Enzyme design. Structure first.
Site, mmCIF file in Angstrom:
data_model
loop_
_atom_site.group_PDB
_atom_site.id
_atom_site.type_symbol
_atom_site.label_atom_id
_atom_site.label_comp_id
_atom_site.label_asym_id
_atom_site.label_seq_id
_atom_site.Cartn_x
_atom_site.Cartn_y
_atom_site.Cartn_z
ATOM 1 N N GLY A 88 0.817 -1.222 0.000
ATOM 2 C CA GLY A 88 0.000 0.000 0.000
ATOM 3 C C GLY A 88 0.843 1.261 0.000
ATOM 4 O O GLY A 88 1.823 1.340 -0.798
ATOM 5 N N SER A 89 0.455 2.240 0.814
ATOM 6 C CA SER A 89 0.923 3.637 0.698
ATOM 7 C C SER A 89 2.435 3.706 0.942
ATOM 8 O O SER A 89 3.016 4.682 0.541
ATOM 9 C CB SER A 89 0.182 4.543 1.620
ATOM 10 N N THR A 90 3.047 2.690 1.533
ATOM 11 C CA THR A 90 4.511 2.686 1.788
ATOM 12 C C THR A 90 5.327 2.612 0.485
ATOM 13 O O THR A 90 6.513 2.987 0.540
ATOM 14 C CB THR A 90 4.939 1.567 2.740
#
Length: 480
Positions: A229-231
């Site tokens: 995800g956002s990482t």
């Protein structure tokens, strides 16, 4: 004329400062020549007792094996208790002198070091991975020693036991304080590619593996694969800034927090924005925002950065059942697959791959191969992101941690830190809290990934804060 092997002494494993992690300890394994033991039956009840085995069970075993010129009696006896048997002086009883591993730091570094089997061969972790280096070569006896045993060689890990202890403690406390099942924490030197700490929970004592649940044995950092995800949005942004088409002060309209692409609708986790600058897209983790940038630059540029920082690629560490995850490739990247790659649901990775990717960004865009052994001569490594883009993206991540609206619980007491939280999906919909980051933000030294399964940037981020503060101090890194 017969031959018997002379066991070789297994090499010492230390941490990077010479602290012992795995040591070959003397033991004695008693065998017996049944045909000889069969001439001393009146000794059997005393031999049985002294061996822990039971009188009729022991007599049964010897009787049926009365043909065998050879059988073991017991492995692994201490060498002093083991004389207490040769102190009964029973005929038919011959003893071999052997080595067994002791793990002085026990559960703290269980998964990284691993353990040996009954034959003194590596079964998990480094013990397996460098089994050949550590095992040396058995000797040979006929009359004469036809071959002298060569001892295994010493191995210094990249692990700093002081950071490993701090990581083990802080992750353990976070799992109890968030009633979570399991978790990982990886610390890397961003200049050398060294893994300074790798702790998984649950852990186990490799010196006592009797009650050992396969769950506790799981090296999660290297095996669990998840959608990051956002990482991975920093790698999407690195591609955006390398395109020639984007700068940090550019604005994207993300109103009303949804974007329809044909039959699919991209939906933001927070839907209270219209114009955002590129930093704001990261702080808010807007999937609409990163999707519109990805459509403008093309998935190919993003795929290429994610490939070059090692996401979905072999790590080259040689740990057993290391998983590689999946960076999917296409000829034709449709809008849906482009968007899902850009906001990190379009691939799966391990905590070790993520930390290695964050190391490259932190090391001003230069990738260095991962190492689980002490690095004395740093490899040249590969400039995968320009130092200027890497610098810009570092400054964006520092704002993610320290700007108004940002992840304040990742702020590092004493220093400026940089990083990004995410919600992972396991690879039937399991969820992990992620935090990926590095410090110090302006001159990075350490990269870190925290993974916490099913807690029952509020969860992973405070752990990063506490382990990073401790790691930077233990490494005498100067406060910025």
């Amino acid at each position: 004329v017969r031959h018997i092997a002379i066991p070789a002494h297994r090499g010492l494993i230390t941490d990077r400062n010479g602290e012992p992690l795995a040591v070959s300890t003397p033991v004695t394994t008693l065998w017996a020549n049944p045909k000889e033991l069969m001439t001393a039956k009146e000794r059997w009840p005393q031999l049985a007792a002294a061996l822990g085995q039971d009188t009729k069970l022991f007599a049964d075993r010897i009787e049926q094996n009365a043909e065998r010129e050879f059988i073991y009696l017991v492995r692994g006896l201490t060498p002093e208790q083991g004389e207490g048997v040769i102190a009964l002086k029973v005929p038919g009883v011959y003893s071999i002198e052997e080595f067994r591993r002791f793990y002085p730091a026990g559960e703290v570094v269980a998964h990284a070091v691993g353990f040996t089997d009954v034959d003194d061969r590596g079964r998990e972790g480094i013990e397996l991975a460098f089994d050949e280096w550590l095992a040396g070569v058995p000797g040979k006896r006929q009359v004469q020693v036809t071959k002298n045993a060569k001892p295994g060689k010493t191995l210094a890990l990249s692990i700093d036991l002081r950071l490993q202890y701090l990581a083990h403690r802080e992750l353990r406390n976070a799992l109890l304080e968030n009633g979570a099942k399991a978790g990982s924490l990886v610390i890397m030197d961003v200049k050398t590619g060294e893994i300074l700490a790798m702790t998984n929970q649950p852990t186990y004592n490799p010196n006592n593996r009797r009650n050992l649940q396969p769950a506790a044995m799981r090296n999660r950092a290297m095996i669990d694969v998840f959608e990051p995800g956002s990482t991975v949005k920093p790698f999407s942004m690195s591609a955006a800034l390398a395109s020639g088409r984007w700068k940090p002060s550019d604005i994207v309209d993300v109103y009303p927090g949804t974007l329809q692409i044909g039959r699919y609708t991209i939906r933001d986790v927070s839907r209270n924005s219209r114009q955002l600058d590129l930093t704001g897209i990261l702080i808010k983790s807007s999937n609409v925002g990163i999707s519109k940038i990805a459509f403008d630059i093309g998935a190919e540029s993003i795929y290429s950065v994610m490939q070059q920082v090692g996401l979905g690629q072999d790590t080259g560490l040689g740990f057993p059942g290391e998983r590689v995850g999946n960076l999917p490739n296409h000829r034709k990247w449709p809008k849906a697959e482009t968007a899902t790659l850009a906001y990190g649901y379009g691939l799966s990775v391990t905590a070790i791959q993520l930390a290695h990717a964050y190391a490259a960004l932190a090391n001003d865009g230069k990738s260095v191969p991962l190492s689980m052994t002490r690095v004395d001569r740093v490899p040249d490594g590969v400039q995968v992101i320009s130092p200027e883009v890497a610098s810009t993206v570092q400054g964006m991540l520092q704002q993610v941690v320290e700007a108004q609206g940002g992840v304040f619980r990742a702020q590092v007491p004493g220093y400026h830190a940089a990083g990004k939280s995410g919600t992972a999906r396991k690879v039937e919909n399991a969820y992990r809290s992620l935090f990926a980051g590095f410090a110090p933000a302006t001159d990075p030294r350490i990269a870190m990934v925290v993974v916490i399964d099913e807690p029952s940037g509020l969860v992973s981020a405070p752990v990063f804060s506490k382990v990073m503060a401790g790691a930077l101090r233990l490494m005498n890194v100067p406060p910025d």
